[PDB]
Write a protein that binds this DNA or RNA. Structure first.
Ligand SMILES: [Zn+2]
Ligand SMILES: [Zn+2]
Lengths: 126, 128
RNA sequence: GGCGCGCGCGCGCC
RNA sequence: GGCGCGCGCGCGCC
């Protein structure tokens, strides 16, 4: 349906749009685009682990000045290296009303959840 | 012997608070404790945001009597003609007497024991 | 990241 | 007190 914005919960800076969100295995969420990479920084995860289909390499934080709010992790998924965000760190804002809402779990936030597609990235990267 | 009775220990200092046998439930939601033995285990002071709700008149927040703990245990209310303490299971360690196993419950609804309903006749029979 | 629990605390409703 | 929500810190399992 309509498009929404994701704002950092701590500093409230624009993070990304739900239009660029892709769902893996119906439970993990990543964001497509090179623009988004400017929004977060990556750093060594203290306790690296491997679950489901990923290999946890680091945690990502808000790229902003004094913010650095924990946004999620960065992993290895198949032939890719992608960030994985937790809805709990962001504020969802309806673009046409300014109405903001907070979700604790991805399952409680109902929007168009488009599945992650490897062919969708090799088309934008090649 | 009844091997369902449980001890309630202050979560912060581990001191004995009371037994589940002395616990009475008001309106299927609020839990209070019977007897003076329990009255010696806590202290109280006026509540910040309180008073009227349900059939209660929140008259104070109660804490663990141990001067080196003072853990929050609940509140004291005016219920009908009585003045009673109301406790939150979230503040205690549940220890099963028969096996010593300790458990932590965040909600009364999760703690399963023989829940005896509060009854004024009981209150009275013990006052005279 | 998902799920779960713990510790400390704030706010609303009754 | 019950119920809901949020803030900060930590742990377990995958
Ligand atoms: Zn931020
Ligand atoms: Zn204590």
């Amino acid at each position: 349906k309509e498009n929404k914005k994701l704002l950092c919960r701590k500093c409230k800076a624009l993070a990304c749009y739900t239009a660029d969100v892709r769902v893996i295995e119906e439970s993990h969420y990543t964001v497509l685009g090179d623009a988004f990479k400017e929004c977060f920084v990556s750093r060594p995860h203290p306790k690296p682990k491997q679950f489901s289909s990923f290999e946890k390499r680091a945690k990502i934080f808000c790229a902003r000045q004094n913010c650095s709010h924990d946004w999620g992790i960065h992993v290895k998924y198949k032939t890719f290296e992608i960030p994985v965000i937790k809805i709990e760190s962001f504020v969802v804002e309806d673009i046409a009303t300014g109405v903001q809402t907070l979700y604790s779990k991805w399952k409680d936030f109902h929007f168009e959840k488009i599945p992650f597609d490897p062919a969708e990235m090799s088309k934008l990267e090649h």
